[PDB]
Design an enzyme around this catalytic site. Structure first.
Site, PDB file in Angstrom:
ATOM      1  N   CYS A   9       0.905  -1.139   0.000  1.00  0.00           N
ATOM      2  CA  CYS A   9       0.000   0.000   0.000  1.00  0.00           C
ATOM      3  C   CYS A   9       0.956   1.203   0.000  1.00  0.00           C
ATOM      4  O   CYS A   9       2.165   1.005  -0.168  1.00  0.00           O
ATOM      5  CB  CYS A   9      -0.972  -0.024   1.183  1.00  0.00           C
ATOM      6  SG  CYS A   9      -0.297   0.147   2.794  1.00  0.00           S
ATOM      7  N   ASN A  12       2.320   1.381   4.126  1.00  0.00           N
ATOM      8  CA  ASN A  12       2.431   0.146   4.924  1.00  0.00           C
ATOM      9  C   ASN A  12       1.982   0.482   6.368  1.00  0.00           C
ATOM     10  O   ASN A  12       2.595   0.073   7.335  1.00  0.00           O
ATOM     11  CB  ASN A  12       3.878  -0.385   4.911  1.00  0.00           C
ATOM     12  CG  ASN A  12       4.019  -1.789   5.552  1.00  0.00           C
ATOM     13  OD1 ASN A  12       4.977  -2.052   6.284  1.00  0.00           O
ATOM     14  ND2 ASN A  12       3.080  -2.676   5.269  1.00  0.00           N
ATOM     15  N   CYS A  14      -1.945   1.461   7.123  1.00  0.00           N
ATOM     16  CA  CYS A  14      -3.341   1.147   7.368  1.00  0.00           C
ATOM     17  C   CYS A  14      -3.755  -0.131   6.690  1.00  0.00           C
ATOM     18  O   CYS A  14      -4.179  -1.075   7.357  1.00  0.00           O
ATOM     19  CB  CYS A  14      -4.262   2.292   6.880  1.00  0.00           C
ATOM     20  SG  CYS A  14      -3.982   3.936   7.606  1.00  0.00           S
ATOM     21  N   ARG A  15      -3.575  -0.171   5.369  1.00  0.00           N
ATOM     22  CA  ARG A  15      -3.990  -1.297   4.527  1.00  0.00           C
ATOM     23  C   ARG A  15      -3.173  -2.550   4.334  1.00  0.00           C
ATOM     24  O   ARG A  15      -3.689  -3.632   4.549  1.00  0.00           O
ATOM     25  CB  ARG A  15      -4.345  -0.793   3.105  1.00  0.00           C
ATOM     26  CG  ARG A  15      -5.572   0.108   3.024  1.00  0.00           C
ATOM     27  CD  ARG A  15      -5.636   0.838   1.690  1.00  0.00           C
ATOM     28  NE  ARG A  15      -4.509   1.774   1.510  1.00  0.00           N
ATOM     29  CZ  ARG A  15      -4.222   2.364   0.346  1.00  0.00           C
ATOM     30  NH1 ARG A  15      -4.968   2.134  -0.727  1.00  0.00           N
ATOM     31  NH2 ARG A  15      -3.170   3.151   0.233  1.00  0.00           N
ATOM     32  N   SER A  16      -1.925  -2.449   3.875  1.00  0.00           N
ATOM     33  CA  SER A  16      -1.181  -3.683   3.636  1.00  0.00           C
ATOM     34  C   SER A  16      -0.901  -4.509   4.924  1.00  0.00           C
ATOM     35  O   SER A  16      -0.824  -5.733   4.840  1.00  0.00           O
ATOM     36  CB  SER A  16       0.113  -3.417   2.813  1.00  0.00           C
ATOM     37  OG  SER A  16       0.958  -2.445   3.413  1.00  0.00           O
ATOM     38  N   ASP A 128      -7.876   3.901   0.436  1.00  0.00           N
ATOM     39  CA  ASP A 128      -7.134   4.399   1.573  1.00  0.00           C
ATOM     40  C   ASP A 128      -8.135   4.877   2.615  1.00  0.00           C
ATOM     41  O   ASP A 128      -8.902   5.804   2.350  1.00  0.00           O
ATOM     42  CB  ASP A 128      -6.214   5.544   1.102  1.00  0.00           C
ATOM     43  CG  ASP A 128      -5.255   6.014   2.187  1.00  0.00           C
ATOM     44  OD1 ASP A 128      -5.519   5.693   3.362  1.00  0.00           O
ATOM     45  OD2 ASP A 128      -4.253   6.701   1.878  1.00  0.00           O
TER      46      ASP A 128
END
Length: 156
Positions: A9, A12, A14-16, A128
């Protein structure tokens, strides 16, 4: 023989990290651990290197009984030869990844949503959630869980 997967993301943060935790979790659930070698997550920027994930990402994971332990790291060109799949969250991630990708490197770069079905269960792009709220993180969780399952279903 075994495959290695990296989720990517922008930060690195929130998402990945979430994608990595959920994916490790589903692999466990299904007893597919033997099919994998490395399962990681990186960000394209270095802005949160060394940092633990967004507290809302951790809260949502905890809320669903998913274990998460990570410190931010940034993808490097060498990684393109270390992983079989480098999976981005949105199109901007993919654009940056394709630009830094060494020609002839092993990694296949894709959108996690390329494993989405044509039926409207979830949106394809994992947006995001940083400026959003806990509700956005919950939806990201639902999306990632769904694609993790489709991936395990179609890639092994």
């Amino acid at each position: 023989p075994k495959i290695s997967v990296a989720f990517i993301c922008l930060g690195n943060f929130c998402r990945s990290p979430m994608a990595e935790a959920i994916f490790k979790h589903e692999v466990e659930k299904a007893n597919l651990e033997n099919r994998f070698n490395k399962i990681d997550s990186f960000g394209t920027s270095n802005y949160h290197v060394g940092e633990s994930p967004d507290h809302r990402t951790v809260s949502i994971c905890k809320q669903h009984g998913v274990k998460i332990n990570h410190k931010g790291k940034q993808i490097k060109t060498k990684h393109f030869d270390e992983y079989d799949y480098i999976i981005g969250m949105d199109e901007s991630n993919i654009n940056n990844l394709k630009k830094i990708q060494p020609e002839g490197s092993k990694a296949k770069v894709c959108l996690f949503g390329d494993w989405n079905t044509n039926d409207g269960t979830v949106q394809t792009i994992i947006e995001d959630p940083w400026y959003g709220d806990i509700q956005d993180f919950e939806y990201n969780f639902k999306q990632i869980t769904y694609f993790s399952k489709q991936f395990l279903k179609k890639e092994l």
